[PDB]
Ligand binder design. Structure first.
Ligand SMILES: Nc1ncnc2c1ncn2[C@@H]1O[C@H](COP(=O)(O)OP(=O)(O)OP(=O)(O)O)[C@@H](O)[C@H]1O
Ligand SMILES: Nc1ncnc2c1ncn2[C@@H]1O[C@H](COP(=O)(O)OP(=O)(O)OP(=O)(O)O)[C@@H](O)[C@H]1O
Ligand SMILES: Nc1ncnc2c1ncn2[C@@H]1O[C@H](COP(=O)(O)OP(=O)(O)OP(=O)(O)O)[C@@H](O)[C@H]1O
Lengths: 523, 521, 514
């Protein structure tokens, strides 16, 4: 009826008017997404009480776990989540850097629109300041790596990735990842993140863990074969039991004399299926399902090493390692769906029998980090720290450039951008000045999580950078609000990880600010 | 005077409904005009999110709520078919035509008198349009500035330079010696795992399914192309026979006897390879669309023959035009007269899949434009930007007359319609006066999207007067009156010809309605 | 609440609301409005001043426009409802550009530029014709035909033209206090005329009086000849009713000694034949004194007013007398025909054919009460229009010929303060064309039909074009005799720029608390 809905004319979608500030609703959409991860940044950040959709409880503080479980529905806030998945590509750090800096970009952009600045002019000042931010970032590089492929160089530089993923394991996790990547580091240009597979066994704690070469499974060998150098690996996801035909196959039992005939016939058919693997020359059989007791007798008869893997995630790891495809039928004697491995043997680590899949005539790039833990909740948090620890050094196969962290490269970048924004004439000096103040929220998020007043830390950082004392970052202490040198403490992040993080967070401010209306459409 | 199961508006308020409905649609589409405009969001309901600025996607695929605004959405479906350009600017004319006509209806004027002035002002603006257009010959310099006008509105000013050279060289290679241009000759392909600035041109054709064998050549300098449509896998019988066997073990032997009709045709491919250019530094490529058995692939891959399978029907049509090979439907009639040839046949690998290329041809009559992007919504937006960019350069070569952009035509057309005496009626000048201010909404809203003042921009471009030909337009960066013919802001003549024709027809039919009633609703 | 531009949108709706009300009473073809006092008083008028000052509106913004028309009649006396129709379209045409994002101060800067150009254009169209009898008829015809139902439009012109022409001599300034307006009942509406002499409310009431005196000497008196107090040191004392009869004869003897003194002054100065004597005593007269004067031929009048006595001083020439003890012949005047006009109920004394009265009385007759007040407000608007024609010798063409000619002169005009003042002369040109627009609706013709014909009429000469109230054709105002005042059109463009500024210059409205 009269009066009609102003500007809402497309499928009843809520189109806010000019007084209702339709562009301001997208700013509040990315503000609520940034506020869930603002207090989660840093080593003093708070954990998140994760309740999964399969009714499983989790306590973790990873930035990727928050975005995957908290199902966002606002598509204006989905531009940063799609940019955070772009942050997961080509680097393994900066997922919180995208959510905080682009969230502080749009929060400072709302103060510019309240004066009366156009959205087409502010967005041109962000792309100007983004190109100016890409020039000072090579100039902020203090030191670089030594490129000697030793344990001491890797473990000293890995202390940044272990920080804020799992606090307290700074001395343990820095040496466990360091023993794995140095086996792939002679292979120049071949360091890959999928080569390092993580396995977890329920044990005592972190200090009982160890590093092994090749593919290591926690399940022991079901057979009595200890070591065999057979290349043919036939993986079967079906359980070892009686043969059920794909045809009709009606088995009739009436009296007890037919009970002993068909039970012996199932044992004879189980003997024929193990013999169907023995003629093709395959002495390595991995069983996906359960193994019967009579099938264990046929394993030691033909001297075939039988191992049982119940989990499907570890069975899929062998499909992309040796090329063996899991067959659902009861052991089909084919050769094309098999794998290739030089030697497989059974060994013990920490009084636990594990099976090793390594290669001696091939160079070898598969490594397995056997993790031990009492609780499965905290053990999964260390498992994600391995993936964010290896991907921290997967980018170091490129040009090794290191920048100081902890607000050292944040205030120094905010100082030189404001100097470029002060001398720049025209109305575009307002957007560059707010691009520098968006860089101050990340040391503000680091100081507020440590129980320290944020304005006292920022003025302490701007006093030492005005005198030229570079590489000064936040001192992690709730009682001491002072600062410390970052080159002496050992915090050095990646230059390429800081390059894509400012680039993707600025383009997230480009994509959201270009959208000023949301319309639902029917196909 | 009304019946139930109906709703009839008897007074003159039914005219105020359709005027205020188009005035509401004007304020929606006025924020996305020009390169300084914003974008809109497409919510499919399931999760598919797209951002487009094209007025066809904002009206045809985009669904409406008001029934009166559904008629204007069908106008952009007719506008995209004839010229493919100007659907955002078409709604802004009708949005101010019915708003300006509402001032005279409140004074008691009939809508028939106002819609007669729109026909008189149409022919005056159309006769003025023949003196504004420039009949200069097209070249590389002008077609870039035509591409810089259309592509810069769907681009965030980072992909403007790398997409301009792609749409110019593709059109100039498919049109020469006054032949009619076909937009279906350009193949649009999409690729992931790269940046958005990696959009380049491919001389040949990108095929989806490639060869799956470790012994395949990664790059072939020269190879003979053989087009087939017969499956080289295990098929049924060809002669009057059947499936006769003694047991289940005998059935595998008759399949081998059935494969003898198939494997004989595989050996004829090797026979045509060795005799016809089977020396060193030579190759062979099979582009058979149907499936080929991997046992037959083992004998072909060892001889250096790159055999492909599982292609599309749209891909096989361009393969016959690129190499010139006749599609073979029977291997018994195999002859080298149906053999084609191509240049560098190589298979560039990506992060996920592999795709082959048949580039470096003399005249394949098919140019494939390969788009690369990291997202799905960015991959669709650049594809929407190319098809909007390919249509603006297509109209420039067929119709050699081009007009200056940046509102320079509509400002000069507003001067001609104001300085015009009534020739058909006395009261018809009130429709001419409303049509004179209707063309002024295009430099009016271009100042709002750029952030400048609406009245400071309109006055300064209207005060530009001299004793010579002068067409001035708007400047989105400075705000000063800028000559659009000098800086390189150019539009097509067919865009402005359909802008004057479609606006005087549709805004007539909205003004000529009297009552709105439900016929079964 | 609502701290935004909504304070401007509510004020223009009161301007559009007051425009649509007062647009039906412009010109002779328009309608009228009724003014009900709530008790039963009915008044019909087309004057916009009484339609805004006496008429009460509920809107507070429209009450400011009611104070505009009160300031319009004090300087000119015409064009009050035409003041509302321009400023209604001035704020209506301003809203077309304010919603586009323009500040109202910029449109105000363009309105003052259009005011100086239109005031310079008024100096070129004015006609400095010599003021005579014929040109004052056309000025009185444009003013009086808008308050008359076209049965008194021919009779009332010669009553107001000959009245102001009798008082316009020796380059003296025109004074409206010299014109006396009297009203009488029991007659028709067309029986009105001009009277050379004055009209007294109460006349002589005696059967022995003369019905007409052709020549007489008028003695100005102000002495109360009724039962008055003692002028000698005495008192009022009585013992019974018989003592009061002796006291009333001892008190009234101070009266009739003065009454016989007037007869002694009548017999001394011009006591022969072919003479006369009228008494114009303002105070009360003893009924016994009326028998003493009427036997010798003296017509005695009583119960006069204070303003009428000053007009009797200028008519006859007698000095106002305060005591009869020093009667002297220099207090005597002279007049011509002194007779009584007989009505159905009352009688009125008429003293016309004076020597040099310097005062003309307009006699307006009407059958009804509300008919008398309508012509009384019509004669005051008609006499002030001719007074603007005599003092200001230049006149302008009527029938909206100035406003259409100003619309073309404002189109061919470039601003010299800024470029954004181009809408200020644009909206001022469109709002001035509402007078040929509203004259088409009141006449019953189409609005856009006669607007085209009044704007297409151009030539290579000096030619004015106006609207036709009968046929709707282009009509030259000089050829038919339709003329307005230059002083009214000068105050029209000056007052319209001030009032449309102050409505455009507000942004917030607050509730005061005194
Ligand atoms: N102990 C510390 N000392 C100095 N700086 C630190 C410390 N902990 C965190 N930072 C700063 O925090 C930022 C990265 O912190 P953080 O480890 O929370 O990111 P992240 O968790 O690795 O990202 P992701 O969620 O992708 O794993 C860097 O800029 C770094 O300088
Ligand atoms: N570089 C430029 N500078 C100034 N104005 C421009 C420029 N390029 C285009 N314009 C103006 O923008 C208008 C077209 O705007 P836009 O490209 O947003 O709509 P469109 O895409 O052409 O319409 P449709 O969606 O119907 O195809 C043209 O009329 C032209 O005058
Ligand atoms: N005979 C006529 N034909 C056409 N127009 C006329 C005629 N007489 C007067 N007018 C026009 O009418 C206008 C005056 O209208 P009207 O007398 O109704 O209002 P008004 O009494 O002047 O208003 P106000 O009392 O405020 O002065 C003049 O401007 C004149 O041009």
């Amino acid at each position: 009826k009269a009066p009609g809905f102003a500007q809402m004319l497309k499928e009843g979608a809520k189109h806010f008017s000019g007084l209702e500030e339709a562009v301001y609703r997208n700013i509040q959409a990315c503000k609520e997404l940034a506020q869930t991860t603002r207090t989660a940044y840093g080593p003093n950040g708070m954990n998140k009480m994760v309740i999964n959709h399969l009714e499983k409880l989790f306590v973790t503080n990873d930035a990727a776990t928050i975005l995957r479980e908290l199902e966002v529905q606002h598509p204006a806030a989905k531009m940063i989540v799609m940019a955070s998945h772009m942050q997961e590509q080509e680097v393994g750090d900066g997922t919180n850097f995208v959510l905080v800096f682009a969230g502080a970009l749009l929060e400072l952009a709302e103060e510019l629109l309240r004066i009366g600045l156009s959205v087409s002019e502010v967005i041109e000042g962000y792309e100007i300041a983004c190109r100016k931010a890409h020039e000072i970032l090579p100039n902020l590089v203090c030191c670089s790596a030594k490129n000697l492929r030793d344990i001491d160089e890797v473990s000293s530089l890995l202390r940044t990735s272990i920080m804020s993923k799992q606090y307290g394991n700074e001395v343990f996790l820095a040496k466990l990842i360091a023993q794995a990547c140095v086996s792939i580091f002679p292979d120049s240009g071949h360091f890959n993140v999928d080569n390092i597979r993580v396995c977890k066994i329920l044990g005592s704690g972190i200090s009982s863990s160890s590093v092994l070469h090749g593919m290591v499974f926690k399940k022991e060998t079901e057979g009595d074969v200890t070591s065999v150098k057979d290349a043919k690996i036939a993986v079967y996801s079906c359980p070892f039991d009686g043969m059920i035909t794909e045809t009709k196959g009606t088995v009739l039992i009436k009296t007890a004399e037919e009970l002993m005939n068909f039970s012996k016939g199932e044992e004879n058919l189980m003997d024929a299926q193990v013999k169907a693997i023995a003629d093709t020359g395959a002495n390595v059989v991995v069983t996906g399902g359960k193994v019967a007791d009579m099938a264990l007798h046929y394993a030691n008869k033909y001297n075939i090493m039988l191992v049982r893997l119940n989990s499907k995630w570890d069975l899929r790891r062998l499909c992309k390692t040796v090329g063996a495809t899991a067959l659902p039928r009861l052991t089909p004697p084919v050769l094309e769906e098999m794998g290739h491995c030089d030697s497989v043997y059974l060994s013990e680590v920490g009084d636990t029998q594990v099976v090793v899949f390594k290669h001696e005539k091939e160079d070898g790039a598969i490594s397995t980090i056997v993790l031990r833990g009492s609780t499965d909740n905290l053990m999964d948090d260390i498992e994600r720290a391995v993936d964010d620890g290896v991907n921290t050094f997967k980018v170091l196969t490129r040009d090794k450039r290191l920048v100081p962290g902890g607000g050292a490269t944040e205030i120094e970048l905010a100082k030189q951008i404001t100097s470029y924004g002060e001398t720049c004439p025209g109305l575009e000096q307002y957007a560059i000045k707010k691009f520098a103040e968006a860089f101050e929220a990340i040391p503000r998020a680091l100081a507020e999580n440590s129980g320290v007043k944020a304005n006292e830390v920022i003025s302490k950082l701007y006093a030492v950078h005005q005198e030229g004392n570079k590489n000064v970052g936040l001192d992690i202490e709730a009682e001491v609000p002072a600062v410390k040198d970052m080159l002496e403490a050992g915090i050095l992040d990646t230059y390429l990880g800081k390059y894509w993080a400012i680039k993707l967070a600025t383009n997230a401010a480009v994509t959201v600010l270009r959208v000023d209306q949301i319309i639902m459409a029917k196909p | 005077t009304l019946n139930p199961k109906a709703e009839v508006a008897r007074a003159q308020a039914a005219l105020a409904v359709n005027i205020s409905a188009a005035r509401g649609l004007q304020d929606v589409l006025r924020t996305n005009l020009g390169p300084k405009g914003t974008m809109k969001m497409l919510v499919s309901g399931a999760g598919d999110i797209k951002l487009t600025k094209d007025g066809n996607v904002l009206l045809h695929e985009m669904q409406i709520q008001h029934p009166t605004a559904s008629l204007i959405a069908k106008v952009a479906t007719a506008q995209d078919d004839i010229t493919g350009d100007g659907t955002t600017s078409n709604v802004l004319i009708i949005g101010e035509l019915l708003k300006q006509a509402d001032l005279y209806i409140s004074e008691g004027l009939h809508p028939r008198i106002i819609t007669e002035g729109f026909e008189a002002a149409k022919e005056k603006a159309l006769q003025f349009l023949e003196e504004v257009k420039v009949s200069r010959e097209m070249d590389r310099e002008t077609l870039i500035d035509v591409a810089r006008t259309s592509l810069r509105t769907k681009v965030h000013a980072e992909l403007a330079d790398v997409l301009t050279e792609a749409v110019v060289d593709s059109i100039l290679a498919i049109k020469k010696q006054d032949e009619p241009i076909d937009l279906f000759m350009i193949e649009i392909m999409e690729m992931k795992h790269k940046s958005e600035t990696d959009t380049s041109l491919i001389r040949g054709l990108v095929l989806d399914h490639g060869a799956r064998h470790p012994d395949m050549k990664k790059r072939v300098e020269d190879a003979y192309i053989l087009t087939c449509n017969v499956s080289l896998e295990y098929e049924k019988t060809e002669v009057n026979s059947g499936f006769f066997y003694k047991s289940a073990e005998e059935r595998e032997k008759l399949v081998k006897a059935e494969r003898k009709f198939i494997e004989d045709r595989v050996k004829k491919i090797i026979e045509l390879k060795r005799k016809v250019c089977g020396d060193s530094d030579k190759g062979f490529v099979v582009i058979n669309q149907k499936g080929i058995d991997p046992f037959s692939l083992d004998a072909l891959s060892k001889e250096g023959i790159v055999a492909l399978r599982r292609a599309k029907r749209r891909n096989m049509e361009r393969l016959t035009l690129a190499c010139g090979g006749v599609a073979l439907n029977s291997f018994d009639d195999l002859s080298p007269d149906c053999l084609g040839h191509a240049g560098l046949v190589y298979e560039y690998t990506l992060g996920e899949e592999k795709f082959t290329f048949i580039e470096k041809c003399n005249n394949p009559r098919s140019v494939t434009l390969l788009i690369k992007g990291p997202n799905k919504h960015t991959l669709t937006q650049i594809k929407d930007a190319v098809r909007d960019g390919l249509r603006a350069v297509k109209n420039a070569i067929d119709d050699g007359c081009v007009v200056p952009g940046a509102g320079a035509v509509e400002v000069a057309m507003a001067e001609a319609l104001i300085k015009h005496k009534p020739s058909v009626k006395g009261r018809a000048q009130l429709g001419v006066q409303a049509f004179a201010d209707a063309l002024l909404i295009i430099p009016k809203v271009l100042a709002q999207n750029s952030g400048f003042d609406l009245q400071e921009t309109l006055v300064k471009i209207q005060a530009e007067h001299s004793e010579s030909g002068q067409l001035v337009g708007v400047d989105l960066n400075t705000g000063e009156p800028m000559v659009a013919a000098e800086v390189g802001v150019w539009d097509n003549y067919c865009v402005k010809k359909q802008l004057l024709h479609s606006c005087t027809v549709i805004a007539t039919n909205i003004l000529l309605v009297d009552e709105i009633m439900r016929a079964g609703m």
